[PDB]
Amino acid sequence: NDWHFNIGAMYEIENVGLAEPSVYFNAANGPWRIALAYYQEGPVDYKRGTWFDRPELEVHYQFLENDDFSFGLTGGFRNYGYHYVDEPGKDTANMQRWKIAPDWDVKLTDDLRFNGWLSMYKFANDLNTTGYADTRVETETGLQYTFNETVALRVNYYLERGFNMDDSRNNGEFSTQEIRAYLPLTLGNHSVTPCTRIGLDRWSNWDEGHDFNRVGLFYGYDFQNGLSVSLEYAFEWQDHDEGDSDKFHYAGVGVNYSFHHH
Numbered sequence: 624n625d626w627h628f629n630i631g632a633m634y635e636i637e638n639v640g641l642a643e644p645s646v647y648f649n650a651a652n653g654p655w656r657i658a659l660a661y662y663q664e665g666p667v668d669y670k671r672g673t674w675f676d677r678p679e680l681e682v683h684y685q686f687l688e689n690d691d692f693s694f695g696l697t698g699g700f701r702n703y704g705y706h707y708v709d710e711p712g713k714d715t716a717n718m719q720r721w722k723i724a725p726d727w728d729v730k731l732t733d734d735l736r737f738n739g740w741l742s743m744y745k746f747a748n749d750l751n752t753t754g755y756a757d758t759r760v761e762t763e764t765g766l767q768y769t770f771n772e773t774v775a776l777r778v779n780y781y782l783e784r785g786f787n788m789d790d791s792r793n794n795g796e797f798s799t800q801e802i803r804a805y806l807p808l809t810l811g812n813h814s815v816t817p818c819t820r821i822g823l824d825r826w827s828n829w830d831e832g833h834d835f836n837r838v839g840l841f842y843g844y845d846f847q848n849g850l851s852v853s854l855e856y857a858f859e860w861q862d863h864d865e866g867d868s869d870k871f872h873y874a875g876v877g878v879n880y881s882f883h884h885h
């Protein structure tokens with residue numbers, strides 16, 4: 624069929640600093656898509672501190688794609704390669720993550736749709752060092768009302784939960800529930816998505832713990848020649864000042880190149 628390829632890169636920054644460069648490549652033909660990525664995370668002022676890398680391979684299969692009903696499945700693999708500095712015990716660790724994730728999209732109306740994905744994760748190796756729960760489920764699922772070709776609203780429920788198959792561990796065991804709202808606007812070559820996340824409930828073993836809000840803004844531009852760029856800002860908080868975990872800032876820049884064959 625037609626071979627569709629993308630290459631791209633991104634740089635993300637977080638603080639209350641973390642610098643996070645990443646690269647990716649994906650390739651698609653008929654129902655099959657394969658994706659490779661490399662991500663790294665560590666202090667802005669690398670003094671210096673703990674960092675890690677995150678090579679990843681994902682494969683996607685589209686079972687069905689049409690107006691009334693679409694569904695597909697992702698399988699993935701990550702290694703998390705940790706390089707500890709200043710911390711009695713270890714110096715490096717490797718933890719793998721295995722992912723199986725169905726996705727779906729079903730029409731309820733000419734303007735209303737039900738869509739989502741669900742993910743099942745296993746984490747293997749060096750879990751004692753790294754603190755993770757060995758099992759995890761993640762889902763974002765909900766409704767999309769389309770106003771017109773320019774504007775759509777999406778309101779999703781989001782759950783992530785951590786479990787331990789090894790019933791003698793509570794390491795990395797948490798729960799998080801959110802409502803997440805988006806308003807993707809398409810304005811010629813410009814894309815703008817305002818988004819919100821409202822904590823419904825969260826508990827974890829590091830307490831985290833009550834009402835956690837995020838507001839953000841994605842800006843995208845397509846040059847109509849294969850190239851596109853992205854810029855995103857996000858602000859997260861608990862309730863500031865005393866509250867408990869107050870403020871967090873996120874900024875990200877990306878470039879994608881899209882080219883085809885056949």
Ligand SMILES: *CC(=O)NCCNS(=O)(=O)c1cccc2c(N(C)C)cccc12
Nearest residue numbers: 805816817818839840841843853855875
């Ligand atoms: C406010 C907001 O983020 N809205 C959704 C963005 N949609 S997108 O264009 O697919 C996009 C762009 C850049 C990053 C994105 C992430 N990241 C976790 C970085 C996640 C989903 C979409 C997305």
Ligand SMILES: CCCCCCCCOCCOCCOCCOCCO
Nearest residue numbers: 630631646647648649659660661678679
């Ligand atoms: C096969 C042609 C691809 C050409 C793409 C060039 C630039 C984009 O890079 C995408 C590759 O993605 C990362 C690959 O996986 C990294 C493996 O890291 C292992 C380190 O231990």
Ligand SMILES: CCCCCCCCOCCOCCOCCOCCO
Nearest residue numbers: 732734735766767768769770776777778
């Ligand atoms: C602006 C987002 C609301 C889109 C609602 C789409 C419903 C179209 O079918 C008509 C159903 O009539 C019942 C009204 O339900 C409205 C839902 O609540 C409105 C937003 O709070």
Ligand SMILES: CCCCCCCCOCCOCCOCCOCCO
Nearest residue numbers: 776778802803804805806821822823824
């Ligand atoms: C752009 C349209 C967006 C409108 C939909 C927003 C819906 C947000 O709903 C959030 C519901 O929050 C419930 C709060 O949950 C905590 C309840 O208190 C329990 C503790 O006793």
